[PDB]
Amino acid sequence: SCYIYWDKIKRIASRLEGMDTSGVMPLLDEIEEIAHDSTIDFESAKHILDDAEMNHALSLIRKFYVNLGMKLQMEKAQEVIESDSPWETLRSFYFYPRYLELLKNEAALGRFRRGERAVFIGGGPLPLTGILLSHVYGMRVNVVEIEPDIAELSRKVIEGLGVDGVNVITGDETVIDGLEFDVLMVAALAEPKRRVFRNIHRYVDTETRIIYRTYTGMRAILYAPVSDDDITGFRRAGVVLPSGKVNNTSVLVFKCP
Amino acid sequence: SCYIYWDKIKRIASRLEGMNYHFDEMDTSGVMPLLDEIEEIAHDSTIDFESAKHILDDAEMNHALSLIRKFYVNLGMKLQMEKAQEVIESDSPWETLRSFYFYPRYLELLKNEAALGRFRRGERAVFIGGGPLPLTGILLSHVYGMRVNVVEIEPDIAELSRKVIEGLGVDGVNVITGDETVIDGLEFDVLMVAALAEPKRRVFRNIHRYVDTETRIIYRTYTGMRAILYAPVSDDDITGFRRAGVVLPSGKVNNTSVLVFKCPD
Ligand SMILES: C[S@@+](CC[C@H](N)C(=O)[O-])C[C@H]1O[C@@H](n2cnc3c(N)ncnc32)[C@H](O)[C@@H]1O
Ligand SMILES: C[S@@+](CC[C@H](N)C(=O)[O-])C[C@H]1O[C@@H](n2cnc3c(N)ncnc32)[C@H](O)[C@@H]1O
Ligand SMILES: [Br-]
Ligand SMILES: [Br-]
Ligand SMILES: [Br-]
């Protein structure tokens, strides 16, 4: 092999090695131009990313991606809380249009209905999907967030927005033991995958629609995919591969029998 | 896991196993139901590539998968032999040709390949792995206007293939008896590798020493649940090449088609 992206990735990584949310946006663009390149097939993608010589470069890019991701969420959270026009400020979040698309295809993958009960594991500072489950899909939502200070901030976001029927529970994935719900979603950044799915397995039954977010193809450059082994005791029952600028693949699983 | 498909597949293989016990020689008419059960699993678009490998790479499935794969190649090769001899005896060769079970699939597959590899009338193609019914090289010439060499390692199979070509009055399709190393001695614009050309590792290593970095190369492989039918070409098999376009099949087409160029130096 001799893919032109091999060198391009290596070069972007050289500029992260020694390393302002606004001022690093062009780095994101460079990385996403490659991730989103639809001429790169899943075999090619895997050839680049699975290669031992690519190991360090992959880790630099992934580190950058989750860091900018988090910082953009933080910043927006606070912005939303301080805003006279919170829903307008929410709408201008860099990733907003993407999340709409994503949750739009998940709603179909998961047959979402008004009044169903959704649980969302890993809400973060800006619980946007939580918010959209209720605001758009009219579901009754519990968002779960492990870090108390982030959970506290996420409540101030929900409250600032005046969204109804979205509550934030401070805790790990085992808080699902005392909940009743129709749909369970697992955030892309919900970690650690192996423990998270072992525990989910304990507290759902075979009818619970479970949706998780992962990364497939060239988009795996952004984050480590949920493995086969991670979803032991489940079966896949539908997948949505992304297009456009949407980065996550959404997978629907059911607990085995 | 707990895919419905797992037991389906196990029962199919059980039937194959009991049948191979009774008869070495396939009864091609008699086994069509079984192909169709296998193709309904292969063609199910509800199954994603990730699950397909969950299913198909499990060590517990290896015995069943091998029996299904041996069936698919043994059936397709017998169907080819039967059709070839029919064509040769027929007073309506084209009509006979057209009734070959997989015929419509090949027209659809070749079309997508024609766009993928930008086939132009007059260009020289070489097809490795011709078989008794050299449908792909026949179409390259009759439909696509290419000047074709078909390579077939088995001399009696190459022989039968020439006779089919003649029977059909097809010009510009020559048949070489040899292995993939005959391509050193040939000029070609495009090179194509039958999904059944074996062994992959050797074939692609000989391709590598005998082509340049400009020559279009197209091979047929199996992806998703269609990999139930035959072992795919691995990324290790194509070291020293880069992928430059893939055509994922729909409908009843079995083959994925991949374009590659040899790497620089
Ligand atoms: C996943 S993101 C935000 C989620 C998603 N981007 C959204 O807001 O629509 C980051 C958060 O998930 C939380 N998290 C990761 N693993 C968790 C688990 N097992 N249980 C509860 N929260 C978790 C982290 O504290 C982090 O703030
Ligand atoms: C590949 S199939 C036929 C393909 C199909 N008949 C078509 O036209 O598209 C049959 C042949 O490939 C031949 N074959 C397998 N490996 C080969 C190789 N490395 N070189 C030349 N022939 C090969 C086998 O002997 C077998 O007859
Ligand atoms: Br820079
Ligand atoms: Br592919
Ligand atoms: Br005729």
Side-chain angles (χ1 to χ4, degrees), chain B residues 73 76-77 80-81 100 106 109-110 113 127-139 150-155 157-158 176-182 192-200 202-204 206 220 230 255:
Chain B
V73 57
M77 291 295 332
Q80 284 191 67
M81 288 296 297
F100 174 55
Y106 279 64
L109 176 77
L110 254 309
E113 287 172 337
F127 186 84
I128 302 188
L133 198 73
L135 216 204
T136 298
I138 291 167
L139 291 178
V150 165
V151 185
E152 171 50 55
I153 192 164
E154 298 296 347
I157 300 299
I176 299 187
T177 309
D179 69 26
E180 72 265 12
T181 65
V182 310
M192 299 185 66
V193 188
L196 267 45
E198 290 295 359
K200 304 303 176 176
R202 194 195 87 195
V203 162
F204 277 103
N206 292 320
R220 281 152 189 188
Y230 195 81
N255 290 137

Side-chain angles (χ1 to χ4, degrees), chain A residues 147-205:
Chain A
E147 310 274 27
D149 299 342
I150 309 294
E152 281 162 25
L153 205 215
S154 83
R155 299 190 180 90
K156 288 164 290 169
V157 176
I158 300 159
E159 284 158 25
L161 288 166
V163 186
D164 184 75
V166 191
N167 171 245
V168 177
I169 301 168
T170 301
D172 66 36
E173 74 280 359
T174 73
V175 310
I176 83 190
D177 182 31
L179 295 185
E180 312 175 338
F181 51 92
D182 300 311
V183 359
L184 169 71
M185 308 187 47
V186 177
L189 274 40
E191 292 297 350
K193 304 303 171 177
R194 187 159 87 157
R195 182 190 82 209
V196 166
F197 282 103
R198 279 194 306 267
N199 282 146
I200 290 167
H201 192 263
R202 301 173 168 135
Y203 307 124
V204 297
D205 54 41

Side-chain angles (χ1 to χ4, degrees), chain A:
Chain A
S1 229
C2 56
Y3 294 103
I4 43 97
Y5 311 91
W6 181 278
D7 284 346
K8 287 201 241 202
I9 296 173
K10 283 309 188 78
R11 285 288 179 169
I12 296 162
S14 75
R15 292 182 274 108
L16 311 167
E17 169 69 53
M19 195 205 258
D20 204 325
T21 261
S22 230
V24 306
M25 294 306 289
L27 279 164
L28 186 66
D29 285 338
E30 292 182 74
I31 290 157
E32 302 196 326
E33 259 229 308
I34 300 164
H36 297 158
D37 189 349
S38 76
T39 67
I40 302 171
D41 72 53
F42 284 19
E43 294 281 321
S44 295
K46 173 165 219 280
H47 174 97
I48 280 134
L49 307 180
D50 268 1
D51 192 299
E53 270 184 50
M54 185 66 62
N55 196 81
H56 184 61
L58 191 51
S59 87
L60 292 181
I61 292 179
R62 292 173 169 175
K63 172 103 153 102
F64 168 83
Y65 168 79
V66 71
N67 276 127
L68 173 68
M70 208 351 188
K71 187 171 259 224
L72 277 167
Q73 279 183 69
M74 288 300 283
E75 282 169 7
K76 185 63 51 165
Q78 191 50 247
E79 229 211 325
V80 164
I81 295 157
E82 311 297 327
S83 178
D84 294 350
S85 303
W87 258 109
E88 182 177 297
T89 299
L90 190 37
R91 285 192 308 266
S92 78
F93 178 45
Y94 184 66
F95 298 104
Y96 189 75
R98 294 178 202 200
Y99 279 57
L100 279 185
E101 257 318 88
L102 178 73
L103 193 56
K104 201 186 106 278
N105 298 333
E106 290 167 330
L109 173 64
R111 220 326 185 138
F112 299 172
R113 313 184 65 104
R114 301 191 56 90
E116 283 189 324
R117 297 154 295 169
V119 172
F120 184 98
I121 293 165
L126 194 76
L128 213 199
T129 299
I131 288 169
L132 299 174
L133 285 174
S134 167
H135 186 76
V136 179
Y137 296 88
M139 304 179 88
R140 294 190 190 295
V141 180
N142 280 125
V143 170
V144 185
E145 167 58 44
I146 211 159
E147 310 274 27
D149 299 342
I150 309 294
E152 281 162 25
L153 205 215
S154 83
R155 299 190 180 90
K156 288 164 290 169
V157 176
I158 300 159
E159 284 158 25
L161 288 166
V163 186
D164 184 75
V166 191
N167 171 245
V168 177
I169 301 168
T170 301
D172 66 36
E173 74 280 359
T174 73
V175 310
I176 83 190
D177 182 31
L179 295 185
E180 312 175 338
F181 51 92
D182 300 311
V183 359
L184 169 71
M185 308 187 47
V186 177
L189 274 40
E191 292 297 350
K193 304 303 171 177
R194 187 159 87 157
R195 182 190 82 209
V196 166
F197 282 103
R198 279 194 306 267
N199 282 146
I200 290 167
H201 192 263
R202 301 173 168 135
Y203 307 124
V204 297
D205 54 41
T206 42
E207 333 318 302
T208 311
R209 285 108 89 188
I210 299 154
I211 301 164
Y212 72 88
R213 299 150 177 189
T214 187
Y215 296 80
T216 54
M218 202 50 20
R219 277 173 185 79
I221 206 190
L222 300 168
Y223 200 82
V226 171
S227 75
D228 292 336
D229 267 339
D230 281 339
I231 72 170
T232 39
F234 304 85
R235 52 176 182 92
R236 306 157 104 116
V239 177
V240 174
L241 300 166
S243 61
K245 306 217 159 189
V246 175
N247 281 316
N248 290 129
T249 297
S250 299
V251 192
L252 163 88
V253 298
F254 293 97
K255 173 172 184 166
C256 298

